[PDB]
Amino acid sequence: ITGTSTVGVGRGVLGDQKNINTTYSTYYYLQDNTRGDGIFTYDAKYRTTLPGSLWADADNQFFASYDAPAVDAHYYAGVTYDYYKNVHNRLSYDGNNAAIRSSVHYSQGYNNAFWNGSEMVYGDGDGQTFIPLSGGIDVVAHELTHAVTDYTAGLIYQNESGAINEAISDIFGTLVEFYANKNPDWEIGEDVYTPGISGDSLRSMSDPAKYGDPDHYSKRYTGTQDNGGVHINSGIINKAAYLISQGGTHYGVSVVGIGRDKLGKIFYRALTQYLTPTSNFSQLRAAAVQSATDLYGSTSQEVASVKQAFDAVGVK
Numbered sequence: 305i306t307g308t309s310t311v312g313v314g315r316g317v318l319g320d321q322k323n324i325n326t327t328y329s330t331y332y333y334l335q336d337n338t339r340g341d342g343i344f345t346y347d348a349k350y351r352t353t354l355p356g357s358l359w360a361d362a363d364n365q366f367f368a369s370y371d372a373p374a375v376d377a378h379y380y381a382g383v384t385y386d387y388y389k390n391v392h393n394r395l396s397y398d399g400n401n402a403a404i405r406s407s408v409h410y411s412q413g414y415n416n417a418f419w420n421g422s423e424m425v426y427g428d429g430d431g432q433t434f435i436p437l438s439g440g441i442d443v444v445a446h447e448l449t450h451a452v453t454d455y456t457a458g459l460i461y462q463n464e465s466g467a468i469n470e471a472i473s474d475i476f477g478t479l480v481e482f483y484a485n486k487n488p489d490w491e492i493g494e495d496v497y498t499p500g501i502s503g504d505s506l507r508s509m510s511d512p513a514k515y516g517d518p519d520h521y522s523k524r525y526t527g528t529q530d531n532g533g534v535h536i537n538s539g540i541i542n543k544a545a546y547l548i549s550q551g552g553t554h555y556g557v558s559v560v561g562i563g564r565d566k567l568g569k570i571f572y573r574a575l576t577q578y579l580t581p582t583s584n585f586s587q588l589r590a591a592a593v594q595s596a597t598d599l600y601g602s603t604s605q606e607v608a609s610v611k612q613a614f615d616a617v618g619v620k
């Protein structure tokens with residue numbers, strides 16, 4: 305749409321009030337002109353046909369309950385862009401300011417979100433397992449990070465390389481959650497998962513085992529479901545990532561933590577310079593050590609902590 309950049313106000317899924325960037329042309333659209341080539345939020349109207357309609361509102365006020373998921377998808381996509389640009393010097397998911405598109409109200413009671421190769425898609429949840437998915441900032445950054453991975457390493461969505469793909473999304477969605485200082489933790493989807501149960505999450509980075517995910521290479525899932533456990537085996541990597549940043553003793557192996565900032569730097573460098581579509585866990589180790597070496601020197605504490613970490617989780 306061609307129009308005047310203005311700013312609207314709305315309420316998110318969690319009932320929080322926020323200002324969003326909009327465009328005026330007869331109607332007020334959910335189109336942010338301030339970021340790259342723009343952030344566009346669409347209404348899929350409970351259908352599966354994408355992208356649906358560019359979101360139009362009559363008064364620039366987004367307080368209806370139907371508006372909630374749109375506000376959040378729009379706002380959080382903005383934050384994610386900002387994180388990439390500010391922290392890693394990367395312009396949009398392609399590094400070239402490509403437009404970011406998201407569709408909300410996908411299907412009926414759809415309990416998931418995904419990057420389909422060209423845009424983000426968000427279900428509303430069935431109201432018990434999940435509430436509208438764009439209400440979680442870690443969810444939104446996990447999804448956009450899939451776009452990043454697609455344009456960089458291009459990790460295939462299956463087996464070890466798919467678990468890596470999943471873990472990077474979880475790592476960067478957590479980093480984005482800390483970046484925004486939005487009640488940060490090392491958990492995944494806590495804000496939109498099981499509205500009736502407190503203190504739970506979809507996955508844990510700090511202790512993947514809490515939910516039945518492997519926290520050691522010896523415990524890896526070798527089967528066939530979930531594209532060969534792309535969401536299962538990611539726990540081995542998430543645990544490793546957690547230990548480099550925070551430190552700790554896992555299975556008798558002690559890791560000195562080097563913090564979140566440095567974790568994000570080594571991982572981004574591994575992703576964009578060393579990882580390929582067919583990388584495996586053992587190649588991620590090599591890639592991480594090498595990024596750490598480039599950045600901090602071979603004899604650094606950083607390099608030392610990345611090695612311990614992978615050793616703690618049985619990766620090499």
Ligand SMILES: CC(C)C[C@H](NP(=O)(O)O[C@@H]1O[C@@H](C)[C@H](O)[C@@H](O)[C@H]1O)C(=O)N[C@@H](Cc1c[nH]c2ccccc12)C(=O)O
Nearest residue numbers: 415416417418419437443446447450461470493506530535
């Ligand atoms: C962060 C999360 C909210 C969305 C996330 N999906 P995503 O990583 O983007 O994508 C996964 O792989 C794609 C090839 C599929 O088409 C997607 O639906 C999903 O299966 C996921 O963790 N999916 C898992 C976990 C999950 C989410 N909702 C669920 C409902 C029931 C069971 C498991 C799940 C899965 O699909 O297994």
Ligand SMILES: [Ca+2]
Nearest residue numbers: 361363365366
């Ligand atoms: Ca309105």
Ligand SMILES: [Ca+2]
Nearest residue numbers: 486487488489
């Ligand atoms: Ca949180």
Ligand SMILES: [Ca+2]
Nearest residue numbers: 442489491492
């Ligand atoms: Ca979280």
Ligand SMILES: [Ca+2]
Nearest residue numbers: 497498499501
């Ligand atoms: Ca819950």
Ligand SMILES: [Zn+2]
Nearest residue numbers: 446450470473
């Ligand atoms: Zn994913």
